[PDB]
Design a protein around this ligand. Sequence first.
Ligand SMILES: [Ca+2]
Ligand SMILES: [Ca+2]
Ligand SMILES: [Ca+2]
Ligand SMILES: [Ca+2]
Lengths: 237, 237, 237, 237
Amino acid sequence: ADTIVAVELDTYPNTDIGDPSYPHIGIDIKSVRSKKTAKWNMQNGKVGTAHIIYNSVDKRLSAVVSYPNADSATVSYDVDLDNVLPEWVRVGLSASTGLYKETNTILSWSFTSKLKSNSTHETNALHFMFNQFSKDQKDLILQGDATTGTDGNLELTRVSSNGSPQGSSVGRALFYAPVHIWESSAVVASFEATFTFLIKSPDSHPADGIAFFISNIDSSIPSGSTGRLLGLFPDAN
Amino acid sequence: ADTIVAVELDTYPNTDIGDPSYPHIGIDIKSVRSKKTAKWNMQNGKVGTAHIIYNSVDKRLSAVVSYPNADSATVSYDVDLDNVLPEWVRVGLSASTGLYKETNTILSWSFTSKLKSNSTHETNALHFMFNQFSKDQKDLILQGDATTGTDGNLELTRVSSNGSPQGSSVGRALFYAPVHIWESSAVVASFEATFTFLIKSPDSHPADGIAFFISNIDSSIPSGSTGRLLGLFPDAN
Amino acid sequence: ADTIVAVELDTYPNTDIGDPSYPHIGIDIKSVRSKKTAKWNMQNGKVGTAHIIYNSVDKRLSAVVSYPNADSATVSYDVDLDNVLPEWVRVGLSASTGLYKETNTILSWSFTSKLKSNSTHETNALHFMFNQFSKDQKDLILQGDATTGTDGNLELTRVSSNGSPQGSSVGRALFYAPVHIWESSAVVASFEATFTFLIKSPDSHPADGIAFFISNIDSSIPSGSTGRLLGLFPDAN
Amino acid sequence: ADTIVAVELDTYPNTDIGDPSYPHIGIDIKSVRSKKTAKWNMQNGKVGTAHIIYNSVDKRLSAVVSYPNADSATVSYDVDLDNVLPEWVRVGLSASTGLYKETNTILSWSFTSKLKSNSTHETNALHFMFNQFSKDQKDLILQGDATTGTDGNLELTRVSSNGSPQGSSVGRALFYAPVHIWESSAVVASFEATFTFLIKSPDSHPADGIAFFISNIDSSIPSGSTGRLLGLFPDAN
Ligand SMILES: [Ca+2]
Ligand SMILES: [Ca+2]
Ligand SMILES: [Ca+2]
Ligand SMILES: [Ca+2]
């Protein structure tokens, strides 16, 4: 049903569905079994920053995740998104918890998309930047358990009043306007997404992760995509 | 019903509803009878550029319209938009023709909105730029007779196959995402809009004009707003 | 000699040269005696943010200074900068200490200047953003006691090893490239500057302040401009 | 002496120094003998647009050159610029003519450089856009025969009063501020450059080409770099 391209910050190793034995960042092209992963030294309670970049000339989706004072983790995958996605897509953030949990807090999110045509000076562009989320964020489509406004942050999954993360939670936030990522006259199409997050768990084993994703405009959370499926995929195939 | 704040490029003088006896640019705050106008030496068949700027500290909405090789026309009006508009609005372009006509072609449109909060480094921003419009422009809400794709332009009003403008036409195009123009913690809110247009008429008297407007998110063309009402207002009060 | 237009964050009231009896923000047009001031509830040890905006259509230079969780202070002054400054200027930050002192630390600085011409799609722009300063910042001209790199910050005035601010210090940092703020064909010229600062003093009376300024490209610190003259003016006239 | 990384739009095939037998675009890393080339169907008298992109995660310098209504030509090369260039560089445009000639007119030039650090929200950026060049362009360093102001364009090489291109001409224009392309704490460094050009020759064989280049900050035209050496290299090694 949905077409999903995502960059996951997977906190919990589900080795039975192909995760490596550690937190990792991965690039998912229509399956939760990442096409490429990289070890991520996830820091519980620390604010991290993820940068995702791509352009149609190189056809390489790359992501860099870093924590202050720490070395970054980066993952890249050669993929032509014109062959995977529709030309009009929606971009968003997704997160889930299952039996194990963590807060999936987003403190800021910026995205820039550019479609440059072969006509001189013809660039179409979309850019949004959120450094504060209000309770009435009308330009975001919140799905599942995602809420905004709490300390001006976006909480992708359920957090009880006392700051505790809840299990079996799934939430997604998508920018309201469709994003144009391909057009017949485009000579170069590119996008850049950056978001800072705070994954905090009272447990030694947080789960399940946050994912930046791009999908068909009408994408909705697949039934049963809590836990390991990151609110992105209906099954683990 | 709708709350409209608009900057009009009025090509036809309807002196009975307060227009001056010449093409003029004006600032309309909830009425077609401009609060302030300035003579506009409209050039039939030439591509013009309109720049609209505003910020919540100065509370002055200003517009500058120019043609290559010609002197600009500028109009400014002191108005606090927080007292007029809702905090979530939609921005768009509107145009009409009545008994007299003209093409109301938009060749490019860019808009930048910024809400800076009192938290260090906390700027929320939205920016879109269209230098080419495709037939399937999913991020625009087209109302009335407005169409996109024709020579990669946005035609706000009806143009027949042979390039002739049609009379009694009204069309509007609004950016799909709501725009946040005020928030309790904002120290400065500002927006900038620029659009290039081509008004061409086979007649000595073109009508009726193009208007950049900001309105409540669910705004729709008022019944009978063709001609002098610019597809913006239901009557001439 | 130098032509200076500055927005000062004056921490010390020198009532004999016209300062009000409190910390204030003011707009200085070629004199340290501000043309307009506003009370500033300066917060020692807290990071503040100053926003300065101006455009040639309105001819109003406005500044907003805020601290997290506190109400902002704003000052505006109607001034046509084309009548004061050359068309090519340098922009910078200046600060001083005299008998009383404070640290004049800059944590980030961004500036955007735009000159839009009457030719369709003809915008000239310059934008720089510094959120981290390195020891070898080659695109900044550091004058006086200003240094960069220390905790990735820009220290406008002398701070000894143990973090103590030094008295009788003056330092300025200017962006290396000249900025074009006027041109014969420009229909609208505008600039926006934002910088976050940390003024900390061990004393109950910090002095003297930080100022965002615009000057002739070859501007240098006037002899004896420590203390009340903010490293900007040669005397108090 | 100088370290040059350039993307050339070579109009004249000098097969003896390795050029293919046609106009081509190539990526030059410290030698005029391109590391990679692509056939370019150069259109005499037409305005073209070149887009150059690069980021430190992928380490791929790519360029796309297009003409309205024509298919683009693109060339990419895997190169880690941190291993070639200094961390502070100057970016510019260069052009030459030899026995054969052409006008090397630049109508617009924009460049964006970004250095994102591992500290949350820490992006340093530089962006400039020139859509009109004036006679007194103080933020450009013009070398050789390059001049600005003529029809608001930048003429890299000599053009006589009657619009005729002159032979044995070499000119370069560099942005005044140094550009920071690497820093120890940077997690991702990227740049994007776009420029539109008009190469027009009265002859069937125009020469020699235009090149976008990045070099050590103090770069100057090598002696004898007219013609095939593009005002970039001292010899053909
Ligand atoms: Ca997992
Ligand atoms: Ca009218
Ligand atoms: Ca003072
Ligand atoms: Ca050659």
